[PDB]
Amino acid sequence: STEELFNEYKLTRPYMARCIRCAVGSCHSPIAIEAVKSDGHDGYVRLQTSSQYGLDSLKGRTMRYDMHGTIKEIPLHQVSLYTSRPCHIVDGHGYFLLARCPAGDSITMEFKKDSVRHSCSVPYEVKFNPVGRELYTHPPEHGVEQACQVYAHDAQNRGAYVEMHLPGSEVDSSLVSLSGSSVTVTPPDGTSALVECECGGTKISETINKTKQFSQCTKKEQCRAYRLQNDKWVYNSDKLPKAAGATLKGKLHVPFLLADGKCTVPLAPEPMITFGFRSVSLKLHPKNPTYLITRQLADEPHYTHELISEPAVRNFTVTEKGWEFVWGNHPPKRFWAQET
Amino acid sequence: GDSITMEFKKDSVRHSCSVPYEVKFNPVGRELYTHPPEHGVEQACQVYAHDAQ
Amino acid sequence: STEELFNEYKLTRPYMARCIRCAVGSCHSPIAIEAVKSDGHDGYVRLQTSSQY
Amino acid sequence: CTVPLAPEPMITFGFRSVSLKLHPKNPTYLITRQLADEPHYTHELISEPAVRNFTVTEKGWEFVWGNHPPKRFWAQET
Amino acid sequence: YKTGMDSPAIKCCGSQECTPTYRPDEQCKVFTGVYPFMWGGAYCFCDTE
Amino acid sequence: GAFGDIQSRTVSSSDLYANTNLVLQRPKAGAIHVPYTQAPSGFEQWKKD
Amino acid sequence: YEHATTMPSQAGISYNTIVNRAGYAPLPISITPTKIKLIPTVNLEYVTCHYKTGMDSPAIKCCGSQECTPTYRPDEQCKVFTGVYPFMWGGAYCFCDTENTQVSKAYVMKSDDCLADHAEAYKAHTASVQAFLNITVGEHSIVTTVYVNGETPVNFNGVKITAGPLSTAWTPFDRKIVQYAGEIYNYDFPEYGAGQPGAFGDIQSRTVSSSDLYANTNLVLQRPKAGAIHVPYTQAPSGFEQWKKDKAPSLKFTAPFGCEIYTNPIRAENCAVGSIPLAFDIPDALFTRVSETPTLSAAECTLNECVYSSDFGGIATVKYSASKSGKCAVHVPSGTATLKEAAVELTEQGSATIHFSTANIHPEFRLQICTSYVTCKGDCHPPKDHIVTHPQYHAQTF
Amino acid sequence: DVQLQASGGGSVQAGGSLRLSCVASQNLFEYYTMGWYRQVPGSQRERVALINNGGSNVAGSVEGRFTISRDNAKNSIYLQMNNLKPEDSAVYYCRAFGPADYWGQGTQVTVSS
């Protein structure tokens, strides 16, 4: 069951934050990306977004996000992401999203509401890490299997935790309005509010579902009305204001961990050998940049580290003590000269 | 691209014409990028007019 | 202010002209290319055609 | 228009010597020049990471990297 | 490594102090006279301090 | 900026010596965040080597 | 009381002097040049940009003959073709087989996109120099803009100051100049009426709106394709285009002495060449009598920090016992050391610490302080940094 | 020292429009929030509008009539006034606030019924 592996996110909410570049420009968006970590090999990326996943206002493929205080939802497949070529999302849990993406410099994620498209683009470089010695750009279709490190597709609890936090006091200019002479406050039903005014002296008043008219004010700009909450904690993000007092209320395990799995790598051509006395000519013809890693079995290896992507000829001198060359992911090859 | 093609589809007829006129991208600054980036410092530039003044 | 710019083009008509490349061969297409100009920076291209927009 | 901005090179000082490590994402111009009457102006396009060593005297030295602003330097006695 | 972040501690028309947690390579710095914003207008209404 | 930047006695020592040169710059006006400048992760450059 | 001095031609570095008079105390002078300009006289001759070959409609005739009517457009070419069979979407335009005559006409004008992006030719000569300065004489601080020529002294509070012309009249500008997109190049173009194809200057307009054009691009008319209607042609490419494919790096990046060219009014900023003779008609009013100024006794100079660095990396504390307490001008007649400050407040019996830049391993000199001279001696040491980001602030002794 | 030079002030009638322009001697907007303050003769300086990367906020007295815009490249801020009324007459100063605070010298704006 995932409820015990998902009950933790019944205790928090999504939030709407600052986006340096939405569809317009410097902007406020519900999808600000705090960080994306990508330390796999075949292109698995874990993203931290400001929105929450998998939780109803349960259901699997639904992003639950914020909008000016009100929490809305939409299935994941309406949202999409790209860097230079479109991505393929794997899944998402809580604030984290596991996806498949190509190489690039800037992430750009986008979704669409009934009339307004909301996007966010950030210049966090995407680092694709090829495996072994055969360098490529897209995952292969066959070959030989090796051990690899890949982010886990599912959610699990492990020796790593993050920090949720108490919600703060968010100002709201909609709650504060202008009556005929006084200032009107209409806090949301079932929650208290705090309006600070200096149109006279500095006032601090808490209205608990109490529509209140306060004199001495002419415009609403002389006052600021905040909103208060206790439950539905939020992540230790730098884009939000701190709460009141020590700001610690527990910790939370992390999903999408780097596990040891198996990955297939292509196999390079078997090179053409043409041997003469104490020497060998090699004709090579790789499909891609592949490493030749050679040495001698003597007191001094004279090891050669080099990368070939173009078919080339090479002559080497091999001693009686032996010789080693490794071509791509093939096993090492041994050749000992004989007196002739 | 060295050629430009343009085309539309009638009820059942596809009209399409192509010409080999060079279409060359002109990067700005001292970096020879290919496709427009997302960020960076702001400079003056010369570009066509979107309006029809 | 847009309509005064727009009105002056009501004194012309669209027309055909020969495009060497068709969907098959060389035609007198209705969307012939008079010329193509590309001198901006971001690849925005102005194109001269035989039809009206 | 916005323009791409290249990473910061890695500098290294030495007695009448300056070494530089370079890692361009894309092809970018380096334009270097002495601050004297005679330039030895060097305009070059770098597209691969590389290492390069120049000499700078007490008379000054200048270089511009991609779209970054100009960089001036002056040698002294050590 | 990975850079551990804390939310900024903001006081409007006031002042703050540094509380060293003694975590490794801790960096705490205080800047006055800011004018931060949030979506629903300015987060606060002061001009200085 | 090189090897030895982070030093933990073992995998689960729960302590570490950090020498990574965290330098705090000033944030943007009218924007809540915590910018920073420091040396690159030395492990990255070493595994490049 | 006229006084003449020579100013190094380098903006951003302060210069301190003393006007000495027998019966009066020295008058300090502090001058910091901010910006030095070089404005050559500029003559516009013409502009050049993208060309474009507009084509006239082919005039057609069936069962007859046509003629060529000259029109005298720039590099205009007209030709007659015979024996064709034209066509359009409807069908055959003609039922006459032979003796069908076609007049094909073409010419060149300037691209209408280049009203803002067009290269301009220029003839430059007779350079003049101007300077922004911040002056302080007798705690009278001013910021001024001055021409350096032998005329036009600046006047303030009865003080006249005449700047002597430069010690050298060299210009980084050459006679013949081209500007493009705000960058400027010393390249040789042809004159008016002698342009060539393929190279810069192929087409030539006297101004952007002169509407008188010269064109030479070897435009040749080719024989039309049979069964079609068009004006085939062949010509050399836009010489402006291949010149902008050449683009030798701008004088901004090949100028001598590292002084920066700016093009709003074209000039070169802060060319560090030569020196400016100066002369100071300072009235006697600002001078101070000796009795009005402090006179000291029993002064001792000690070198605290000694490092022959480019900057003022030298600390010297002079202990003194002064009769009166008052600010006064302190200087070194020689060039061994460059003092950071020209004057320091004097107490009755205190000591004064002075910053200076030195270049002698065994620095030894006499410093003049407001009445008298005191010997200063010590030993400097090498600095620690191989390269710095600022120039020298002293002269190098043999 | 950084200087804020304000211009565009003058004399107009009621129902007219104007555009002020304050230009800074240095590129300072990227680190500063720009503000326009009006001062009736004998009254304290009071905010008209403020602008920075987070948007623009205008005073409620002049909402829907005064709008503030910024241009970092030109180092210029513009305040377009429309439908002015006789009480709008005052000396308007541009303020740049950051680690340091700078006040514009100001220009006279007069509007008559």
Q: By the CB < 8 Å criterion, does E24 face chain F?
A: yes
Q: In degrees, to the nearest 5, what angle opens at C-alpha G216 toward C-alphas G211 and G217?
A: 120
Pairing of strands H107-112, H11-13: parallel
- Provide, as residue numbers in chain H, all residues whose Cβ is less than 8 Å from the Cβ of B44: 73
Is-contact A32 E38, C-beta < 8 A?
no
* C29–B18 CB contact, under 8 Å: no
Whether chain H has a CB inside 8 Å of the CB on E42: the answer is yes
Cα angle G343, G347, G353; round to 5:
55
Regarding beta strands D2-3 and C46-49, do their DSSP bridges make them parallel or antiparallel, or are they unpaired? unpaired
What SS3 state is found at G285?
A: helix
Among chain G residues, CA nearest to C26: G228
Contacts of E35 in chain F (CB under 8 A): 29-30
- Which residue, E15, E20, E19, E21, is CA-closest to E34? E15
Q: Please give the interface size between F and H, counted as residue pairs whose CB atoms are below 8 Å apart.
A: 16
- Which residues, including other chains, have CB under 8 Å from residue C8's CB and lie 6 or more apart? none
Angle subtended at Cα G151 by Cα G148 and Cα G154, rounded to the nearest 5 degrees? 70
* H31–F29 CB contact, under 8 Å: yes
Q: How far is A26 from chain B (nearest CA, A)?
A: 12
CB G347 within 8 A of CB G382: no
Q: How many CA atoms lie within 13 A of G144 on its CB side?
A: 21
> Residues of D with CB below 8 A from G308's CB?
77
CA G191 to chain centre: 25
Q: Which of G265, G174, G10, G132 is nearest to D35 (CA)?
A: G10
Which of helix, strand or coil describes residue H6? strand
Q: For residue A196, what are its two tokens?
A: 């600070």
Which residue on chain E is closest to A165 by alpha carbon? Answer: E7
Q: Which residues pair with G5 in a beta bridge?
A: G278
Bridge partners of B14?
Answer: B9
Taking alpha carbons only, the member of A43, A53, A5, A303 closest to residue A155 is A5
D68 contacts: CB under 8 Å, gap ≥ 6? D5, D6
Closest CA to D59 of H7, G258, A133: G258
Burial pattern G323-344, b for ≥16 Cβ within 10 A else e, equals: eeeeebbbbbeeebbbbbbbbb
Nearest to A219 among H53, H54, H61 (CB): H61
- Which long-range contacts does F16-19 make (Cβ < 8 Å, 24+ apart)? F16/E24, F17/E24, F18/E1, F18/E24, F18/E25, F19/E25
Measured distance CA(G278)–CA(G147) in Å, rounded: 12
Whole-angstrom distance, CA of residue G1 vs CA of residue G160: 11
Query: What contacts G298, CB < 8 A, 6 or more positions away?
Result: G320, G321
Give me F18's structure tokens: 């950090």
Residue of F5, F33, F34 best to disrupt the E interface, most CBs of E under 10 A: F34
> With an 8 Å Cβ cutoff, are C40 and B46 in contact?
yes
Q: Which residues pair with D28 in a beta bridge?
A: B31, D46
Q: Residues with Cβ < 8 Å from G230, sequence gap 6 or more?
A: C18, G58, G224
Q: A127, A235, A239: best mutation site toward chain F, by most F Cβ within 10 Å?
A: A239
Taking phi over 0 as left and psi of -120 to 50 as alpha, with beta for the rest, G126 belongs to left
The answer to whether the CB of G17 falls within 8 A of the CB of G136 is no
Among E3, E10, E24, whose Cβ lies nearest the Cβ of F16? E24
Tell me whether E41 touches chain H (CB under 8 Å): yes
Residue D14 sits at φ, ψ, to 5 deg, of -175, 170
Which tokens belong to G393?
Answer: 């602030």
Number of DSSP helices (H) and strands (E) in chain G, helices first: 1, 30
Write out chain B residues lying below 8 Å of C33, CB-based: 4, 6, 17, 19, 21
SS3 call for G349: coil
Residue appearing with tokens 């009445």:
G371
Tell whether D66 is within 8 A of chain B (Cβ): yes
Q: What is the structure's resolution, reported in angstroms to one decimal?
A: 6.0
Smallest Cα distance from H106 to chain A, Å:
24
Pairing of strands A279-283, A272-276: antiparallel
Minimal Cα–Cα distance from D49 to chain G, Å? 23
Chains that touch D (3 or more CB pairs under 8 A): B, G
3-state secondary structure of G128: strand
Number of H helices, E strands in chain C: 1, 4
Q: Which of G242, G260, G238 is nearest to G251 (CA)?
A: G260
Contacts of A189 (CB under 8 A, 6+ apart): A209
Q: Tell me, yes or no, if H27 comes closer than 8 A to chain B by beta carbon.
A: no
Instruction: Give how far B41 is from chain H: nearest CA, Å.
Output: 10
- CA atoms within a 13 Å half-sphere pointing along the CA-CB vector of E46: 13
Q: Are G336 and G365 in contact (CB under 8 A)?
A: yes
Token pair belonging to G251 = 């004088």
Give the dihedral sign, CA G331/G335/G341/G346.
negative
Q: Give the neighbours of chain B: at least 3 Cβ pairs within 8 Å.
A: A, C, D, H
CB neighbour list of residue A38: distance below 8 Å, 6 or more residues apart? A44, A45, A46, A101, A126, A127
Residue A255's Cβ-side half-sphere holds a number of Cα atoms within 13 Å equal to: 21
Asked if E40 lies within 8 A of A236 by C-beta distance, the reply is: no
Q: Mutation target for F interface from H27, H50, H53: give the one with most F CBs within 10 A.
A: H53
Are G160 and G153 spatial neighbours (Cβ–Cβ below 8 Å)?
yes
Query: What's the full length of chain H, in residues?
Result: 113
Distance CA G110, CA E18 (A): 68
Q: Strand pairing partners for G364? A: G377
CA–CA distance, H54 with B40 (Å, rounded to integer):
18
For chain E, how far is it from start to end, CA to CA, in angstroms?
Answer: 36
Return the closest-CA partner of residue D30 out of D18, D39, D38, D42: D42
Cα A35 to the center of its chain, rounded Å: 6
G206 neighbors G193 (Cβ within 8 angstroms):
no
Rounded distance between C-alpha atoms, residue E48 and residue G148, angstroms: 47
Query: Which chains have 3 or more CB–CB distances shorter than 8 Å to chain C?
Result: B, G
Distance CA A296, CA C51 (A): 74
Spatial distance between the Cα atoms of G340 and G354, rounded to a whole number of angstroms: 7
Q: Would you say the C-alpha torsion B45, B50, C2, C4 has a positive or negative sign?
A: positive
The strand order across the sheet containing A333-334 reads A304-308, A290-295, A324-327, A333-334
Q: Assign E21 to helix, strand or coil.
A: coil
The count of CB pairs under 8 A between chains B and H is 3
Q: Is E39 on the interface with H (CB under 8 A)?
A: no
Tell me which chain E residue has its CA closest to the CA of residue F31: E36
Strand partners, A275: A280
**Two structure tokens written together for H84:** 């002015």
A166: Cβ–Cβ under 8 A, 6 or more apart, which residues?
Answer: A230, A233, A243, A244, A247, A249
| Interchain CB distance below 8 Å, H98 and F29 | yes
Integer Cα distance of G35 and E21 in angstroms: 51
CB H54 to CB A219 under 8 A?
no
Nearest chain F alpha carbon to H55:
F30
Q: Are A16 and A65 in contact (CB under 8 A)?
A: yes
Rounded alpha-carbon distances, angstroms, from residue A120 to A218, G357, H54: 39, 55, 16
Which residue in F has a C-alpha nearest to residue A27's C-alpha? F31
Rounded-to-10 torsion of CA H53, H58, H59, H64: -170
d(CA A269, CA A284): 8
Assess D9–B contact: CB distance below 8 Å, yes or no. no
Tell whether C16 lies on the interface with B, counting CB pairs under 8 A. no
Choose among C16, C18, C39: nearest Cβ to G228.
C18
d(CA G290, CA G26): 9
Contacts of F26 in chain H (CB under 8 A): 31, 99
Taking CB atoms and an 8 Å limit, are E7 and A165 in contact across chains? yes
CB burial of residue F13 (10 Å; 0-12, 13-18, 19+): exposed
User: CA–CA separation, G10 vs G18, rounded Å?
Assistant: 20
Closest CA to A129 of A255, A15, A258, A14: A258
Q: Is some CB atom of chain F closer than 8 A to the CB atom of H44?
A: no
Task: Give yes or no for a contact between E44 and H33, defined as CB atoms under 8 angstroms apart.
Answer: no
Query: What architecture does CATH give domain G296-377?
Result: Sandwich (2.60)
CB contact under 8 A, E40 and A174: yes
Secondary structure (H, E, C), chain A = CCCCCCHHHHHECCCCEEECCCCCCCEEECCCEEEEECCCCCCEEEEEECCEECCCCCCCCEEEEEECCEEEEEEHHHCEEECCCECEEEEEECCEEEEECCCECCEEEEEECCCCEEEEEECCCECCCCCCCECCCCCCCCCEEEEEEEECCCCCCCCCEECEECCCCEECCCCEEECCCCEEECCCCCCEEEEEECCCCCEEEEEECCCEEECCCCCCCCEEEEECCCCCEEECCCCCCCCCCCCCCCCEECCCCEEEEEEEECCCCCCEEEEECCEEEEECCCCCCEEEEEECCCCCCCCEEEEECCCCEEEEECECCECEEEECCCCCEECCCCCC
CA D52 to chain centre: 9
DSSP-assigned beta bridge partners for residue A118? A111
**SS3 (DSSP) at D72:** strand
The C-alpha atoms of residue C20 and residue C32 are separated, in whole angstroms, by 9
List Cβ neighbours of E45 (8 Å cut-off, separation of 6 or more): A196, A198, A221, A222, A224, E12
> Within 10 Å of residue G295's Cβ, how many Cβ atoms?
14
C-alpha–C-alpha distance, residues G188 and A217, integer Å: 74
Determine phi and psi for G198, rounding to 5 degrees: 90, -30
Provide CB contacts within 8 A for A16, sequence distance 6+: A28, A29, A30, A50, A65, A66, A67, A68, E39
Residue labelled with tokens 């073409």: G106
This structure was determined by cryo-EM
Of E10, E25, E36, the CB nearest to F18: E25
- DSSP 8-state code for residue C8: G
Q: Which structural domain, as residue segments, surrounds residue A142? A: 3-168+252-263
Neighboring chain C residues of B8 at a CB cutoff of 8 Å: 31
Quick check: B17 and B8 in contact, CB under 8 A?
A: no
> Cβ of C47: how many Cβ atoms within 10 Å?
13
Length of chain D: 78
Return the closest-CA partner of residue G181 out of G230, G247, G129, G127.
G247
G36 Cβ neighbours under 8 A, 6+ residues apart: G9, G11, G129, G130, G131, G132, G269, G270, G271
Interface residue E15 vs chain F (CB under 8 A): no
Unique residue bearing structure tokens 């093939």: A330
Q: How many CB atoms lie within 10 A of CB G314?
A: 25
Give the integer Cα–Cα distance in Å for E5 and E17. 18
Q: For position A54, which CATH number holds?
A: 2.60.40.3200
- E33–chain F nearest CA distance, Å: 10
Searching chain A, which residue's CA lies closest to the CA of residue B35?
A84
Q: Which positions in chain D touch G385 (Cβ < 8 Å)? A: 13, 76, 78
Task: State the number of CA atoms in the 13 A half-sphere of A206 facing the CB.
Answer: 5
Give the strand pairing for G2-8 and G275-281: antiparallel
Residues G66, G82: Cα–Cα separation, whole Å: 10
Residues of D with CB under 8 A from a CB of G: 13-18, 31, 33, 35-39, 41, 43, 56, 58, 60, 62, 64, 72-78
